[PDB]
Design a protein around this ligand. Structure first.
Ligand SMILES: *[C@@H]1O[C@H](CO[C@@H]2O[C@@H](C)[C@@H](O)[C@@H](O)[C@@H]2O)[C@@H](O[C@@H]2O[C@H](CO)[C@@H](O)[C@H](O)[C@H]2NC(C)=O)[C@H](O)[C@H]1NC(C)=O
Ligand SMILES: *[C@@H]1O[C@H](CO)[C@@H](O[C@@H]2O[C@H](CO)[C@@H](O)[C@H](O)[C@H]2NC(C)=O)[C@H](O)[C@H]1NC(C)=O
Ligand SMILES: *[C@@H]1O[C@H](CO)[C@@H](O[C@@H]2O[C@H](CO)[C@@H](O)[C@H](O)[C@H]2NC(C)=O)[C@H](O)[C@H]1NC(C)=O
Ligand SMILES: *[C@@H]1O[C@H](CO)[C@@H](O[C@@H]2O[C@H](CO)[C@@H](O)[C@H](O)[C@H]2NC(C)=O)[C@H](O)[C@H]1NC(C)=O
Ligand SMILES: *[C@@H]1O[C@H](CO)[C@@H](O[C@@H]2O[C@H](CO)[C@@H](O)[C@H](O)[C@H]2NC(C)=O)[C@H](O)[C@H]1NC(C)=O
Ligand SMILES: *[C@@H]1O[C@H](CO)[C@@H](O[C@@H]2O[C@H](CO)[C@@H](O)[C@H](O)[C@H]2NC(C)=O)[C@H](O)[C@H]1NC(C)=O
Ligand SMILES: *[C@@H]1O[C@H](CO)[C@@H](O[C@@H]2O[C@H](CO)[C@@H](O)[C@H](O)[C@H]2NC(C)=O)[C@H](O)[C@H]1NC(C)=O
Ligand SMILES: *[C@@H]1O[C@H](CO)[C@@H](O[C@@H]2O[C@H](CO)[C@@H](O)[C@H](O)[C@H]2NC(C)=O)[C@H](O)[C@H]1NC(C)=O
Ligand SMILES: *[C@@H]1O[C@H](CO)[C@@H](O)[C@H](O)[C@H]1NC(C)=O
Ligand SMILES: *[C@@H]1O[C@H](CO)[C@@H](O)[C@H](O)[C@H]1NC(C)=O
Ligand SMILES: *[C@@H]1O[C@H](CO)[C@@H](O)[C@H](O)[C@H]1NC(C)=O
Ligand SMILES: *[C@@H]1O[C@H](CO)[C@@H](O)[C@H](O)[C@H]1NC(C)=O
Ligand SMILES: *[C@@H]1O[C@H](CO)[C@@H](O)[C@H](O)[C@H]1NC(C)=O
Ligand SMILES: [Zn+2]
Lengths: 411, 320, 147, 208, 49
């Protein structure tokens, strides 16, 4: 691994960080609320009479267990777009609350039911937000919403003073004024009734045919969940490193019993730096600390390859109870040191490891690890009347090497 | 850990990060150079002494009292009294999801305190001669008399006023002890380095909360909510922003490391020129004519107690 | 460019441009930092040339260990090597010492050097080399009485 | 009506997330510090609701019992009725034809098209918010004019109702203060027990 | 002024800039350290007397 990370077949004496250690999770935990009540999608999709798009209906779906596969697996839907959510993962995800909206529109108007759209329907009938989190489901209804001589049950707003806000509704029938001529509450030049009815004859082209639409809006929030997918909740285990999924809160960690005094309304707890740090189990209501599964740089300690192929491994900051492991083990303050042999002697620091520990290849040779010596101890023999004077002298020549320049380069 | 700061536990994100190539190798390599250099900086300042010189048990230093600066055997770290004050006055394994880890220094605080004790013991028992190499013992009052010659005062002024000079020195050390106990802003030069590094890390960690245009700042949300083709578009925004955030941190740490490197080279120069010798350089070793200096270790720093001769009670005379 | 038309190629190229530009900025930034390290080492080498080669330096450990005598510069690839020549005391010997000599009530101090006793006879000698001399009215100065 | 200084009253837990030994800057509708709140004596006049309302009562006989919220405050629109009866807290949403002078049962002449219902010396403080299709109530009871001091209101209940509110009125059984929330950045201090013990209204003054 | 260099008078741009988080605080803080240091540099040279 050192040879590979250095991209060299030979390695000089030293300590080289080659990779990173990580305690992999033992198993996966899933914990959703123990709600058996199936969500009532049937009454929004199979209603006899839908709402006029100018007066689009809304229904809250909550405190129930959903199964969006029943919807998405059906072949009858002509369009099943989703924004900020994927139709497959939608069944694994969980939400606080959901709003189901429904109305009838022309086939040519389905393209307006998307975030950021404009036009008569988008601007004056049903406006989606810029950051819409839901799914738009639509199907042709020329078998139900049209008849010979035309069906005029449905209406849409043709004129308005200003564009609607997202999810805003306006059922007013005040005659719109398109010019300086006052209308005084009656139609005429520049004076038109704000609503109009579709020409739903059954012989019309697909763009003119009626289409039923259901829009599902998902409230992803920090608030407690009430609409989860059909996933079966697993048993709960502690102190093991495990994957977890609490009401959608997904991660990996060491679930530990928490002494943190969560108030009865609180569902999650957070780190000083706003990361999720504790959670309430949705069934037992116990509070669990989420400690991260331990990690650390893996440093390989080696003499030069021209000296020996034997090496030691330092798991930086890792405790020796956590590592999986050529079998000497020594808990330095720098981390768990493996493959090096601890000795009580002290020597000059050959290879530095940290916290006063160094390593060297020494005798039967092995990689020893020792507390480094600062130097030889020496009592100066000081006294109030003794002086030492050199009888002789040594003329010494010392090389000092200093960098002065570097290779002039241009790109 | 560049790959853990950017992607955490996600393999999906880790594979996208590979498209940026060498950036995580460069970041880890740059931080490693900074970390290795911190041990060099400490070795260059404190490991100047060849041998661990020990003070005599009978402290007959001509009346000069070094008890506040020599090691206290009762303390577990064997620090001096002033060194213990300094360590108490500066006030600030890995269990962080963000991949941040603090490496220990090579020399422990106990080893650094052992080097300053050797430097200090050598200075009082042998003067400047332990720097040149032989560590020739000399009575303290006599080496102080040579310090006087060095500042251009005749050596008889030391012996004729030795009691007064010793009383003045002992009182001045007491004032330092009282000052470091009572003051707060004196160590602000070391505390600033701690505050700068802490603030830089809090900045780096808080940047994980930013969206950078993604639907969510939490990368596990995107993977739990969007399929691969859509998730990768959103993750690429987090990767780009987090990578830029980490590059900003590493760049500014390289600049700070160069500031500390300069301060360490300076501290190493003062050790050699002020502690191992007597310096003729004006204001290099405190105000007044330099006599000697005593090193004291501090958290991530060194304190020099510069002893100097200051003229007083000047009187007018006619001259020719 | 060989595979995508302008409208699609420009979208793909803008990714390479953004990444390559950031890659080159990272290199230039770190070279500016390294240049500052070399600049400091060059200023230091220039200081040692002036103070160690063109002179004799009283600065402890500036020009090698021991008392500096002289230095010789030698060029190296992108660097300079200083051969620092220094005097190092050797074979130190213990002597009894005194700060002053009392004579006829006068206190005598060494002009330069230190008083040392071979065990029976007092001598004055230079501090850095044992060369003992008779204590005389010339190599010592008087100041005050012996009390 | 009278007027009084609200001091540091009206802080509440902005989110259902436990936080401890940390200072968290949050941006939400809060009653500004030292705000000039209206004061009434028991007075049951109709008042605007604006962006949100802070309501507090100093009492010794439990005379104040409920509130009504809406726009027309009649059967032409849905309206929210909150009433603390002698045995249960009761909440209802209906097109209530509220009386000209509601009191405790004579609150409305008739009701129809109901769509939501829920059933559960003293300074009582309450905060009412109507944002993003939720009506949210926070409250606290404190043993004791509005006293200067600091305590945080915990969430009492929230209603997932989409109704429109612009004005409200108080229901009495045969003194209180009203303040209005504003979008303010508050730096909140959480102790080791995870309860808010202090706050700084960042827009109040240059020191803040 | 980091927010004015990047966005000028635009509130629409200013809200987008918030998505990048701390970068404008870091830039202003770095320049402030440089500016404060210029007074230190002058004091260190001339205020010696
Ligand atoms: C200097 O001498 C001391 C010992 O003092 C001795 O007694 C004196 C009265 C005088 O006659 C000296 O010259 C004598 O040598 C030496 O210190 C001892 O050294 C040995 C090792 O050589 C060691 O085991 C002892 O512990 C030392 N004692 C102390 C108190 O430290 C010292 O080495 C002599 N120095 C030189 C340069 O010769
Ligand atoms: C490494 O981790 C283990 C736990 O896995 C620690 O062992 C515990 O140590 C405490 C004393 O500190 C004992 O009371 C426990 O009984 C020990 N537990 C076990 C299972 O042995 C160990 O102390 C840690 N080592 C370091 C250096 O932190
Ligand atoms: C001073 O030191 C030198 C060594 O640097 C000594 O010179 C040696 O002396 C011995 C005889 O005692 C000879 O055998 C060696 O060949 C000499 N070496 C050299 C390099 O000349 C010298 O004796 C010492 N002088 C004193 C007075 O101790
Ligand atoms: C050296 O200095 C220390 C103070 O740092 C002196 O210790 C004090 O001595 C007095 C008695 O003279 C005691 O009452 C104090 O409690 C001591 N203080 C401490 C901190 O120990 C010591 O006496 C001085 N020694 C000499 C020889 O002057
Ligand atoms: C101390 O120094 C004196 C000189 O001042 C030495 O005395 C001489 O010793 C030699 C024999 O070694 C005689 O030949 C000389 O005549 C002596 N001179 C005088 C003036 O007496 C003495 O030997 C030295 N002692 C030691 C122990 O070195
Ligand atoms: C809640 O209902 C009221 C009506 O009771 C709405 O108030 C009207 O708003 C329009 C602008 O949209 C004004 O032109 C009218 O003058 C307002 N009437 C009154 C009596 O104030 C209010 O807009 C509705 N709020 C929402 C969010 O739909
Ligand atoms: C307060 O209101 C509650 C309703 O919210 C009343 O409770 C009902 O009381 C009747 C008997 O009078 C029971 O048949 C119902 O089952 C109760 N409903 C619930 C949900 O508990 C209560 O009686 C009222 N109290 C007073 C004093 O009027
Ligand atoms: C309850 O609300 C509905 C509207 O949702 C009212 O129904 C309308 O009643 C008027 C007559 O008053 C009719 O002209 C409308 O056609 C009805 N609309 C619908 C959709 O049916 C109903 O009157 C309300 N009931 C009460 C008692 O107020
Ligand atoms: C609507 O009714 C059909 C049967 O007529 C049923 O298969 C379908 O599931 C119903 N819709 C929903 C959303 O369940
Ligand atoms: C869910 O399960 C727990 C047991 O783990 C049980 O105590 C609780 O009552 C269940 N939920 C409901 C709503 O009953
Ligand atoms: C390897 O070591 C041998 C001595 O054992 C030496 O002769 C040789 O030059 C070395 N080669 C390299 C590439 O270091
Ligand atoms: C090393 O020293 C420790 C005490 O620090 C002791 O417990 C241990 O037995 C010693 N081991 C050897 C091999 O001497
Ligand atoms: C509070 O506001 C009213 C206006 O609504 C004003 O008349 C009154 O003087 C104000 N009181 C204080 C103390 O500011
Ligand atoms: Zn003369």
């Amino acid at each position: 691994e050192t040879k590979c990370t250095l991209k060299s077949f030979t390695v000089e004496k030293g300590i080289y960080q080659t990779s990173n250690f990580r305690v992999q999770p033992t198993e996966s935990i899933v914990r959703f609320p123990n709600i058996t009540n199936l969500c009532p999608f049937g009454e929004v999709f199979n209603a006899t009479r839908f709402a006029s798009v100018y007066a689009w209906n809304r229904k809250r779906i909550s405190n129930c267990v959903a199964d969006y596969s029943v919807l998405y697996n059906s072949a009858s839907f002509s369009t099943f777009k989703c924004y900020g959510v994927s139709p497959t993962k939608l069944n694994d995800l969980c939400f606080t609350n959901v709003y189901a909206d429904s109305f009838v529109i022309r086939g040519d108007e389905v393209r307006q039911i998307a975030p950021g759209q404009t036009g008569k329907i988008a601007d004056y009938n049903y406006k989606l937000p810029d950051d819409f989190t839901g799914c738009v489901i639509a199907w042709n209804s020329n078998n139900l919403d049209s008849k010979v001589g035309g069906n005029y049950n449905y209406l849409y707003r043709l004129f308005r003073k200003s564009n609607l806000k997202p999810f805003e509704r306006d059922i007013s029938t005040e005659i719109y004024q398109a010019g300086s001529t006052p209308c005084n509450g009656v139609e005429g030049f520049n004076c038109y009734f704000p609503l109009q009815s579709y020409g739903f004859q059954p012989t019309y082209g697909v763009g003119y045919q009626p289409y039923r639409v259901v829009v599902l809006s998902f409230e992803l929030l920090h608030a407690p969940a009430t609409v989860c997918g059909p996933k079966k909740s697993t048993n709960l285990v502690k102190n093991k490193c495990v994957n977890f999924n609490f009401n959608g809160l997904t991660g990996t960690g060491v679930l530990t019993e928490s002494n943190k005094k969560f108030l009865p309304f609180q569902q999650f707890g957070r780190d000083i730096d706003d990361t999720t740090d504790a959670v309430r189990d949705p069934q037992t209501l116990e509070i669990l600390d989420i400690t991260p599964c331990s990690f650390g740089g893996v440093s390989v300690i080696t003499p030069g390859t021209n000296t020996s192929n034997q090496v030691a491994v330092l798991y930086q900051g890792v405790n020796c109870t956590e590592v999986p492991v050529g079998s000497n083990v020594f808990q330095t303050r720098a981390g768990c040191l493996i493959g090096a042999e601890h000795v009580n002697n002290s020597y000059e620091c050959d290879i530095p490891i940290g916290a006063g520990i160094c390593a060297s290849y020494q005798t039967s040779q092995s990689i020893i690890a020792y507390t480094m010596s600062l130097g030889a101890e020496n009592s100066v023999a000081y006294s109030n009347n003794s002086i030492a004077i050199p009888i002789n002298f040594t003329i010494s020549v010392t090389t000092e090497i200093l960098p002065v320049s570097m290779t002039k380069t241009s790109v | 850990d560049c790959t853990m700061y950017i992607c955490g536990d996600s393999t999906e994100c880790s594979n996208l990060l590979l498209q940026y190539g060498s950036f995580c190798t460069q970041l880890n390599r740059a931080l490693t150079g900074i970390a290795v250099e911190q041990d060099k900086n400490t070795q260059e300042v404190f490991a100047q002494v060849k041998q661990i010189y020990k003070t005599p048990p009978i402290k007959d230093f001509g009346g000069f009292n070094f008890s506040q600066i020599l090691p206290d055997p009762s303390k577990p770290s064997k620090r001096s009294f002033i060194e213990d004050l300094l360590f108490n006055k500066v006030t600030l394994c890995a269990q962080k999801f963000n991949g941040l880890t603090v490496l220990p220094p090579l020399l422990t605080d106990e080893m650094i305190a052992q080097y300053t004790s050797a430097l200090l013991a050598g200075t009082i028992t042998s003067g400047w001669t332990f720097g040149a190499g032989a560590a020739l013992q000399i009575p303290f009052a006599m080496q102080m008399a040579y310090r006087f010659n060095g500042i251009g005062v005749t050596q008889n002024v030391l012996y004729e006023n030795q009691k007064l000079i010793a009383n003045q020195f002992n009182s001045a050390i007491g004032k330092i002890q009282d000052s470091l106990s009572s003051t707060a802003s004196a160590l602000g030069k070391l505390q600033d380095v701690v505050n700068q590094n802490a603030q830089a890390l809090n900045t780096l960690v808080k940047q994980l909360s930013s969206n950078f245009g993604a639907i969510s700042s939490v990368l596990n949300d995107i993977l739990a909510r969007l399929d691969k083709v859509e998730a990768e578009v959103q993750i690429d925004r987090l990767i780009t922003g987090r990578l830029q955030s980490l590059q900003t941190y590493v760049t500014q740490q390289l600049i700070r490391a160069a500031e500390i490197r300069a301060s360490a080279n300076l501290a190493a120069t003062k050790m050699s020129e002020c502690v191992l010798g007597q310096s003729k350089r004006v204001d290099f070793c405190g105000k007044g004519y330099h006599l000697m200096s005593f090193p004291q270790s501090a958290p991530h720093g060194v304190v020099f107690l510069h002893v100097t001769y200051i003229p007083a009670q000047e009187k007018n005379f006619t001259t020719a | 460019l060989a595979r995508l038309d302008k409208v699609e190629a420009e979208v793909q190229i803008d990714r390479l441009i953004t990444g390559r530009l950031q890659s080159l900025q990272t290199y230039v930034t770190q070279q500016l930092i390294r240049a500052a390290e070399i600049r400091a080492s060059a200023n230091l080498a220039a200081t040692k040339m002036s103070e160690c080669v063109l002179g004799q330096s009283k600065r402890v450990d500036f020009c090698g260990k021991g008392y500096h005598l002289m230095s010789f510069p030698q060029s190296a690839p992108h660097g300079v090597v200083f051969l620092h020549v220094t005097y190092i005391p050797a074979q130190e010997k213990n002597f009894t010492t005194a700060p002053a000599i009392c004579h006829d009530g006068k206190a005598h101090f060494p002009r330069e050097g230190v008083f040392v006793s071979n065990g029976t006879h007092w001598f004055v000698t230079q501090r850095n080399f044992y060369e003992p001399q008779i204590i005389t009215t010339h190599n010592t100065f008087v100041s005050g009485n012996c009390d | 009506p009278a007027y009084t200084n609200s001091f540091t009253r009206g802080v509440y837990y902005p989110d259902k997330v436990f936080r401890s030994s940390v200072l968290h800057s949050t941006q939400d509708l809060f009653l500004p510090f030292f705000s000039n709140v209206t004061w009434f004596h028991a007075d049951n006049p109709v008042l605007p609701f604006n962006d949100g309302v802070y309501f507090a009562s100093t009492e010794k006989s439990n005379i104040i019992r409920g509130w009504i919220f809406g726009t027309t405050l009649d059967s032409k629109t849905q309206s929210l009725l909150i009433v603390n009866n002698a045995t249960n807290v009761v909440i209802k949403v209906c097109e209530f034809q509220f009386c000209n002078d509601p009191f405790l049962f004579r609150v409305y002449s008739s009701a129809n098209n109901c769509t939501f219902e829920y059933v559960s010396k003293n300074l009582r403080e309450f905060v009412f918010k109507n944002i993003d299709g939720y009506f949210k109530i926070y409250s606290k009871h404190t043993p004791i004019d509005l006293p200067q001091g600091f305590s945080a209101l915990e969430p009492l209940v929230d209603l997932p109702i989409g109704i429109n509110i612009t004005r409200f009125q108080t229901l009495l059984a045969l003194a209180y203060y009203v303040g209005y929330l504003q979008p303010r950045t508050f730096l909140l201090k959480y102790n080791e027990n995870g309860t808010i013990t202090d706050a700084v209204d960042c827009a109040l003054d240059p020191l803040s």
